Amino acid sequence: GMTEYKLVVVGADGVGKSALTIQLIQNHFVDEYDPTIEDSYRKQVVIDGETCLLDILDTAGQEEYSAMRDQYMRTGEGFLCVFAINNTKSFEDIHHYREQIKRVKDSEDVPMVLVGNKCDLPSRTVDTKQAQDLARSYGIPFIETSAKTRQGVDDAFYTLVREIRKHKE
Ligand SMILES: Cn1cnc(Cn2ccc3ccc(CNCc4[nH]c5ccccc5c4[C@H]4NC(=O)c5ccc(O)cc54)cc32)c1
Ligand SMILES: Nc1nc2c(ncn2[C@@H]2O[C@H](COP(=O)(O)OP(=O)(O)CP(=O)(O)O)[C@@H](O)[C@H]2O)c(=O)[nH]1
Ligand SMILES: [Mg+2]
């Protein structure tokens, strides 16, 4: 059949939340840095024989708009928790985003995918093993992505849809 999925892209200011979403939807990489307040995007895609209507919320990394988090977290069904592989602080920030999502939703089980973005970059500070260990401690999938090359992009979003589907049963 046809099912809507409300996905939320969260993470530190500059990890590539907007570039990841724009790459998935519009098939192009945004080199520019345009800070986001809040935008939503749409993509109709077939995943495991189901027509999925992805309703994606691209959120603010700027702490200035942190009061918006409570309402979008209550509304969102699944979360892409994005850090950049060249930014250890953004990797540490995942904990705080995950803690707020679980609390606000009263669900330790919340559909979530850990995303290590900017994998096209050689000067990396967060290794694959560090992120795999963190994802294992959360019991969630870990996917390496590049909004530039499209590496892992479809897999990150489709995996999140599959996590929501599983949670609904
Ligand atoms: C706030 N906002 C986001 N997109 C628009 C553009 N827009 C205008 C009318 C129009 C009708 C329909 C949709 C599709 N859903 C947009 C969307 N996708 C989400 C994915 C996950 C969590 C929350 C959403 C939402 C927002 N819906 C909510 O209830 C809400 C609460 C708090 C929010 O900060 C944002 C939203 C866009 C619309 C406005
Ligand atoms: N090399 C490379 N650069 C990336 C990637 N994703 C994003 N960028 C770059 O990082 C910068 C920030 O990306 P952007 O998508 O705006 O990040 P953001 O997390 O949405 C910023 P905000 O939280 O203020 O909305 C941009 O210059 C963009 O080109 C990637 O996968 N690889
Ligand atoms: Mg943005």
Author numbering: 0 to 168
From the article:
The 3 human RAS genes, KRAS, NRAS, and HRAS, encode 4 different RAS proteins (KRAS-4A, KRAS-4B, NRAS, and HRAS) which belong to the protein family of small GTPases that function as binary molecular switches involved in cell signaling. In the “off” state, RAS proteins are bound to the nucleotide guanosine diphosphate (GDP), while in the “on” state they are bound to the nucleotide guanosine triphosphate (GTP). The γ-phosphate of GTP holds 2 regions, switch I and switch II, in a compact conformation that allows interaction with downstream effectors, such as CRAF, PI3Kα, and RALGDS, as well as with the allosteric site of SOS1 and SOS2. Oncogenic mutations in RAS impair GTP hydrolysis, leading to stabilization of the activated GTP-RAS form and enhanced RAS signaling.
